[PDB]
């Protein structure tokens, strides 16, 4: 492939460099339309800019935490972090979010990796070996109420059991209700006067509940869960302007008030170098 | 039972590896795809669309006005604007090109810089745009500027002029984050003759300026952008 | 003697002529078309009023003055009250449509000024409150009036800051969306053909707008000496290939 | 070799090697030739 | 010894994975199969059999009577019953259809709603059943109701009427657990003319109503049902 | 008008059955042409024959 | 590839792709045609 062809002096009536940008086109002008060039080859394919590659590496999408401790006398397991749920999202930690929102609709399978590490912040004789249970709870399933409910039987709901310190990995097909996930949605769920704007089920990817299977030892053990997400089989439509201001909320476009100028001011003139 | 040996790296999680995994939802049938206009396949497809450069960066809070390069009637010989070409920083940085370049470590290729004139139709002007390849200082006067890559632009019916910064380089890749060894030059613009307004007309006229990449362009070695960060996880 | 410059669009019982055009944009290089069976889901036969809905409606005019910040209309909202297009809209459960948008602004060879005319698929607005404040329904359904970016923040309304496109992105990059400029010195109209863009084959026309049309002054209007300091901008829009499905009782929507 | 039955479980896809910027860079209705005048 | 590397996920137990295992009972011979009528292969086979809907839900303890929709002689213009179509909740919820739908997250397809009349043979009646697609309110009077999907039913020799709720939807799947965006409409029924009893006869007559799915139907993404739970393990 | 002026007018034909339009909104919903004043000096609007009965009276 | 000798040790079975609701939806002795009267 040639990156530049050889081209010499020109004295024409045919001027490729004068255009009318009002038309909305970006005319494909090249170095050889306005200087004299020599042949050179590309030596490159643009492999690593493919959208499959761009969205295809694992990104941290969620960090939560649960603890193993005596539940005796706990009136609210959920509240003691005896167990914890997470409604899956890709817009809570901003790194991956800005990447996805370069597109309007996106379609892909997900590969999740879940790393779990334990901490024992206060005096323990040892490090126990805990098994985590991660249950995938689709909308309409009974939700766990205690850390050892009938729910955890999970007879119809996919669940994975792995050890703290290890990693669990499985992949879920594209679960969207429509043909693509909406990265944006300028609508409501119905014509209600007060219903929420922008947040939609069109994006919904399920939800996940974590708990330790082990009963309690004498000390307490903090287990912190990190969920990583990798898109595989990516398809993206309609590019948009990149995110400039900071994010404030999952699912709305809102930016913070009295934010700071995002364009760097010159130290000098327009004329400055 | 077949005998095996495990190598160094067993059990590691590399966020960039690509392997098979069990599906959690065995046998599930995804929604059919329907047709949607606009599919993107490569980021190289989109960095060829031009977008506006806030060249007039001199303000103090972001404003629509930093997209406008002003022009003065009757000045002769003088300089319209100047900038270095660190596409990952400075004026370029918020443009779509600048914004994508920042997802990669290295770039190579030609850039297309165009200026669209917005003055009254009955006015006229001749400007010179000059690209100064690495190695010399930003030009200080047109004489200096005109000895490097340049285009005399004659403002006419055809409203825009497309200047190309041809890839001039020893090393075949440059860093997107500004680096010296790897630096690309300067871009300046001067009156060639001068802007002239018709009667009954007055004041400043402005040029809009765009940037996009030539088909020439290469970007490689993906990394994280300095353009976005956060202090606590967001919630709904 | 054909110029890129003169054009005629006849759609239904209405025709537009421009003698100073700058080509026309067809979003994503695709022209509006009906919904194919292979893409269909709802089993209902659809209704295609054709020429009674696919004609040109001219919205009320705006006034560009030196202080203007820009205006924003949503589709199909802007047309919610135009003739039979609108009736069909409130009466069927689902509908689908593409449009021809023609924005008009003429001046003289002594004026200067340049408007950006852009179509943004799925333009989800931001609340000026920040945090996770929502933007109430009424605020994103201005009707033919559209939203005036130089009007004041209101409560439950969107933010109207132009350097941020009403969503946290910079004005400068709107050029990645199908768009066309109106530069008084060149141009006097802008025309964009919009194919139907959605993640579902057909949708509700009232709970979801699928494009915002935005007209934004970028190079300020500058009139000749002792000229009146303003120009009107007119927007005329025509639904094209419209289909309605799931007819019934007639939606009642807030406000 | 796929070891698993479902398609979601396969590795990353392989390069589009599609690439056609014209839907984004030249969505004009009447074709523009480089070198010919923009507005006739 | 062949060199290997283990990946992330090694040692995990995913309740949904499908692999080989050693048999604990090597060489055991299972009892021969004999023929048994009734084999089921798909849950889609059984949700097409219709079952009764406790439409008359207004009681206070479960009774045979909530299966009976009453009809009054001589009323004109008035409404016989109304319900939304959240097949995973409310009247539908205990029906076989409702009961299976609850094992899945998403459903799509047409529903078949039929009414069998049980009044004396010498009586007569004309009813209108109306399906109102998402987007409008439950109809408030027949005029409103008759502008959407409807069937005038004439009570005759043929005892049952089968109304179909054709799949009317933007999005190709809806949630089985009630959700707004995803909601399906309303179903109402009104006197078209009115029930008329023969002489020597009196009181209320009832309609029985059934629900089953059309062959159209799709259910996907299995999950756990809210319809059953427990607090301690059972024993013998 | 002078050659250096410009204007955009809408001409509308309203078929029998409605009143003479009272504002452009009303007018623009019937047969109409947006005329852009240019180099080409004249605009030709056609009142297409819209009628139930195939002849009308001249009086 | 089965690694084990016994049939119980193989993975899950593969979709019936049988599907015939008529034993449940139309177990009538004399065949009913849709469109013809139910009771003659």
- Helix and strand composition category of chain C: mainly beta
Give a count of the beta strands of chain C, DSSP E runs of length 2 or more: 13
In CATH, the architecture of chain D is: Irregular
Major sheet attributes of chain C: 6 strands, mixed
H and E order of chain D: H
The CATH class of chain C: Mainly Beta
Instruction: Count up the domains of chain C.
Output: 1
Shape field of chain C: globular
Name the largest protein-protein interface in this structure.
Answer: A-B, 96 and 97 residues
Specify the number of helices of chain D.
Answer: 1
Q: Rg of chain C, please?
A: 19 Å
CATH level-4 homologous superfamily of chain D: Picornavirus coat protein VP4
Described by strand count, sense and barrel closure, the largest sheet of chain D is:
none
- Stated plainly, the CATH topology of chain C is called Jelly Rolls
Overview of the molecule:
This is part of a larger assembly, with one copy of chain A (273 residues), three copies of chain B, one copy of chain C (255 residues) and two copies of chain D (40 residues). Chain A contains two helices and twelve strands; from the N terminus they run E-E-E-H-E-E-H-E-E-E-E-E-E-E. With 273 residues, chain A is mainly β. Chain A has a single domain, classed as Jelly Rolls (Sandwich), CATH 2.60.120. The radius of gyration of chain A is 26 Å and the shape is elongated. The two termini of chain A are 36 Å apart. Chain B has 236 residues and is mainly β. Chain B has one domain (1-236): Jelly Rolls (Sandwich). In chain B, strands 3, 4, 7, 10 and 13 form a five-stranded antiparallel sheet that branches. A four-stranded antiparallel sheet of chain B has the order 5-12-8-9. Chain B has a three-stranded antiparallel sheet with strand order 11-6-14, with no helix packed on it. Chain C has one helix at residues 83-91, and strands at residues 7-11, 14-18, 25-26, 57-58, 62-65, 71-75, 92-104, 112-121, 147-148, 179-183, 189-194, 211-222, 230-247. The longest helix of chain C has 9 residues, at 83-91. Chain C starts with 6 loop residues before the first strand and ends in an 8-residue tail after the last strand. Chain C has 255 residues and is mainly beta. Chain C has one helix and 13 strands. Chain C has one domain (1-255): Jelly Rolls (Sandwich), CATH 2.60.120.20. Chain D has 40 residues and is mostly loops. In chain D, 10% of the residues lie in helices and 0% in strands. Chain D has one helix at 22-25. Classes of the chains: A mainly beta (273), B mainly beta (236), C mainly beta (255), D little secondary structure (40). Chains in contact: A-B, A-C, A-D, A-E, B-C, B-D, B-E, C-D, C-E, C-F, E-G. The interface between A and B is large, with 96 and 97 residues. Strand 1 of chain B pairs parallel with strand 1 of chain E, so a sheet runs across the interface.
């Amino acid at each position: 492939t040639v990156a530049s062809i050889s081209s010499g002096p020109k004295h024409t009536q045919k001027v490729p460099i004068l255009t009318a940008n009002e038309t909305g086109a970006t005319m494909p002008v090249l170095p050889s339309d306005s200087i004299e060039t020599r042949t050179t080859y590309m030596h490159f394919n643009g492999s690593e800019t493919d959208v499959e590659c761009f969205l295809g590496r694992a990104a941290c999408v969620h960090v939560t935490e649960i603890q193993n401790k005596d539940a005796t006398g706990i009136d609210n397991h959920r509240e003691a972090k005896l167990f914890n749920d997470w409604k899956i999202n890709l817009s809570s930690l901003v790194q991956l979010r800005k990447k996805l929102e370069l597109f309007t609709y996106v379609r892909f399978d997900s590969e999740y990796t879940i790393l779990a590490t334990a901490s024992q912040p206060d005096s323990a004789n040892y490090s126990s070996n805990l098994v985590v249970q991660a249950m995938y709870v689709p909308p309409g399933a009974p939700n766990p109420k205690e850390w050892d409910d009938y729910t955890w039987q999970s007879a119809s709901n996919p669940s994975v059991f792995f050890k703290v310190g290890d990693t669990s990995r499985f992949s879920l097909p594209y679960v969207g209700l429509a043909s693509a996930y909406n990265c944006f949605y300028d609508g409501y769920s119905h014509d209600d006067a007060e219903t929420q704007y922008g947040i939609t089920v069109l994006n919904h990817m399920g939800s996940m509940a974590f708990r330790i299977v082990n009963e309690h030892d004498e000390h307490k053990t903090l287990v912190k869960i990190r969920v990583y997400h990798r898109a595989k089989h990516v398809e993206a439509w309609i590019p948009r302007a990149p995110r400039a201001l900071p994010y404030t909320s999952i699912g709305r476009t809102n930016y913070p008030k009295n934010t700071e100028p995002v364009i760097k001011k010159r130290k000098g003139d327009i004329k400055s170098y | 039972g077949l005998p095996t040996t495990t190598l160094p790296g067993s059990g590691q999680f590399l966020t960039t590896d690509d392997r098979q995994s069990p599906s959690a939802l065995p046998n599930y049938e995804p929604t059919p795809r329907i047709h949607i206009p606009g599919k993107v396949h490569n980021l190289l497809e989109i960095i060829q669309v031009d977008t506006l450069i806030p060249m007039n960066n001199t303000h103090t809070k972001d404003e629509v006005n930093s997209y406008l390069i002003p022009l003065n009637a009757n000045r002769q010989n003088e300089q319209v604007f100047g900038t270095n070409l660190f596409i990952g920083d400075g004026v370029f940085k918020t443009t779509l090109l600048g914004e994508i370049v920042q997802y990669y470590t290295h770039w190579s290729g030609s850039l297309r810089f165009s200026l669209m004139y917005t003055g009254p139709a009955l006015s006229s002007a001749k400007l010179i745009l000059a690209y100064t390849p690495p190695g010399a200082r930003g030009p200080q006067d047109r004489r200096e500027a005109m000895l490097g890559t340049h285009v005399v632009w004659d403002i006419g019916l055809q409203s825009t002029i497309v200047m190309t910064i041809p890839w001039t380089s020893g090393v075949q890749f440059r860093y997107t984050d500004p680096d010296t060894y790897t630096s690309a030059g300067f871009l300046s613009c001067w009156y060639q003759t001068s802007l002239i307004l018709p009667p009954e007309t007055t004041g400043q006229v402005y040029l809009l300026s765009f940037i996009s990449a030539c088909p020439d362009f290469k970007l490689r070695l993906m990394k994280d952008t300095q353009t976005i960060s956060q202090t606590v996880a967001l919630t709904e | 003697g054909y110029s890129d410059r003169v054009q005629q669009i006849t759609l239904g019982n209405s025709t537009i002529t421009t003698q100073e055009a700058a080509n026309a944009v067809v979003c994503y290089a695709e022209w509006p078309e009906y919904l194919p069976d292979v893409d269909a889901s709802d089993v209902n036969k659809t209704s295609k009023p054709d020429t009674s809905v696919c004609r040109f409606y001219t919205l009320d005019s705006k006034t560009w003055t030196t202080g203007s910040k820009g205006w924003c209309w949503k589709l199909p909202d802007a047309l919610k009250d135009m003739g039979v297009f609108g009736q069909n809209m409130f009466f069927h459960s689902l509908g689908r449509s593409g449009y021809t948008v023609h924005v008009q602004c003429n001046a003289t060879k002594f004026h200067s000024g340049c408007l950006l005319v852009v179509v943004i698929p799925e333009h989800q607005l931001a609340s000026h409150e920040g945090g996770n404040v929502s933007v109430k329904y009424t605020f994103t359904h201005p009707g033919e009036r559209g939203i005036d970016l130089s009007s004041a923040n209101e409560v439950g309304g969107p933010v109207k800051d132009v350097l941020y496109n009403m969503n946290g992105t910079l004005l400068g990059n709107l050029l990645i969306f199908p768009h066309q400029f109106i530069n008084l010195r060149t141009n006097n109209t802008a025309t964009i053909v919009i194919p139907y863009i959605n993640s579902v084959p057909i949708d509700s026309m009232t709970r979801h707008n699928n494009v915002s049309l935005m007209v934004i002054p970028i190079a300020p209007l500058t009139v000749p000496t002792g000229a009146t300091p303003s120009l009107p901008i007119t927007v005329t829009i025509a639904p094209m290939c419209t289909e309605f499905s799931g007819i019934r009782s007639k939606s009642i929507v807030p406000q | 070799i796929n070891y698993y039955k479902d398609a979601a479980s396969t590795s990353s896809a392989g390069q589009s090697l599609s690439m056609d910027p014209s839907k984004f860079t030249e969505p004009v209705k009447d074709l523009m030739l480089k070198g010919a005048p923009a507005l006739n």
